[PDB]
C-alpha cells in the first residue's frame, strides 16, 4: 500500500504480483505479494492467519496477511535468491553434496516441522526454496494452495509447472497427505544433483508418464489401490522400472537409498520428513556457506 515504498517487482507470482518493499516505518526489507475475485474469501483469512504462528528457521515467515479493498496482502520476509536461480547459476559446476545435503537436511526439517503441525505445502519447487548468505534455505508458500484448490495459470495466464507434483495429485487423488511435499523434495533433490529436472512433463499426462517411464507404470503389488484412483486407466502402457543407478549418477547409495524412499509411488510407504532426518545419507551433514553473487 502506502506504508510500504516498492523497491521492485520480484515477479509474478503463483497468485499474484510480488514485490521487494520496505516498511517507511520500521525500515524493514520485505516481500509482499498481491494476491486477486468477488472480495476474496474470508475462509482463506482465518486460514492464512493461521500460518502466521507457523514459524520455524526452515520456513519463511508470514509477517502479516492484510484483506483490503478486493485486495490480499502477504508480508514475508525477505530473502534474496530463490534455489531455481541458484541451480541455474551452479549449472556448469554443480552444487557440491555437502551443500546439497545441508539443503535437503534443512528442508527437511523445515517439513517436519509443518507436518507434525497438519500444514502441508502441496506445491513444492526450486522457486518456492529461498537461501540467504548464511548457507540457510527455507519453504516459501506453504499452507497456501490449501484454500486455493490447485494451481494451473498465475494471473498473468503463466504456465503451471507440474513437475513436481506426486503421482497420487496426477492420478486425481481428493486428498493431499504430506507425502506429496517429500515427493516434490525428492525431484528437487534429484535435480540438484544431476542438475537436470527429475520429471519435466509439459502436460498432466506427459508429467505422469514421465515418472512412469523412470520408476515403472505402478500396480497393485507396489501401490495398493492405484488401479482404483479416479484417474487411472488400464490402457496406461506398462513400463518396466529403469534401474535406479541410471536416475541419480553419480549419487552415492546412500543417496540413491534415501531418494528411493522419497519416491515411493505408494504415499503410504514413502518416507516421512522425521525419518529421512534419520536416514544415514545425513551421518555427514555439515551446513556449508554458499556462494551468492546478489
Ligand atoms: N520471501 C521472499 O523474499 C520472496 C517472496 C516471493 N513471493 O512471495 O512471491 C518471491 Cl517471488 C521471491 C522472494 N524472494 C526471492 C527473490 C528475491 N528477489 C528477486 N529478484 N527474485 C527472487
Known amino acids: 500500500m502506502e506504508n510500504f515504498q516498492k523497491v521492485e517487482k520480484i515477479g509474478e507470482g503463483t497468485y499474484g504480483v510480488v514485490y521487494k518493499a520496505r516498511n517507511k516505518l520500521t525500515g524493514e526489507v520485505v516481500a509482499l505479494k498481491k494476491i486477486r475475485t468477488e472480495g476474496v474469501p474470508s475462509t482463506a483469512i482465518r486460514e492464512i492467519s493461521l500460518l502466521k504462528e507457523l514459524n520455524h528457521p526452515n520456513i519463511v515467515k508470514l509477517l502479516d496477511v492484510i484483506h483490503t479493498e478486493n485486495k490480499l496482502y502477504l508480508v514475508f520476509e525477505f530473502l534474496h535468491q530463490d534455489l531455481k536461480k541458484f541451480m541455474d547459476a551452479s549449472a556448469l559446476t554443480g552444487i557440491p553434496l555437502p551443500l546439497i545435503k545441508s539443503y535437503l537436511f534443512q528442508l527437511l526439517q523445515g517439513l517436519a516441522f509443518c507436518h507434525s503441525h497438519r500444514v ?144 515411493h509411488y505408494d504415499p503410504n510407504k514413502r518416507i516421512s520428513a522425521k525419518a529421512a532426518l534419520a536416514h544415514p545419507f545425513f551421518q555427514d551433514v555439515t551446513k556449508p556457506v554458499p556462494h551468492l553473487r546478489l
Request: proline share 8%.
Open 120 to 263: 502441508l505445502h502441496r506445491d513444492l519447487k526450486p522457486q518456492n526454496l529461498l537461501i540467504n548468505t548464511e548457507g540457510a534455505i527455507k519453504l516459501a508458500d506453504f499452507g497456501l494452495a490449501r484454500a486455493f484448490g490447485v494451481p494451473v495459470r498465475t494471473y498473468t495466464h503463466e504456465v503451471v509447472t507440474l513437475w513436481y507434483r506426486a503421482p497420487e495429485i496426477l492420478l486425481g487423488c481428493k486428498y493431499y497427505s504430506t507425502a506429496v511435499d517429500i515427493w516434490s523434495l525428492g525431484c528437487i533433490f534429484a535435480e540438484m544433483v544431476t542438475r537436470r529436472a527429475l520429471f519435466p512433463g509439459d502436460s498432466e499426462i506427459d508429467q505422469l508418464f514421465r515418472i512412469f517411464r523412470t520408476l515403472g507404470t505402478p500396480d497393485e503389488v507396489v501401490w495398493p489401490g492405484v488401479t482404483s484412483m479416479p484417474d487411472y486407466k488400464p490402457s496406461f502402457p506398462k513400463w518396466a522400472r529403469q534401474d535406479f543407478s541410471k536416475v541419480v549418477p553419480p549419487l552415492d547409495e546412500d543417496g540413491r537409498s534415501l531418494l528411493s524412499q522419497m519416491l
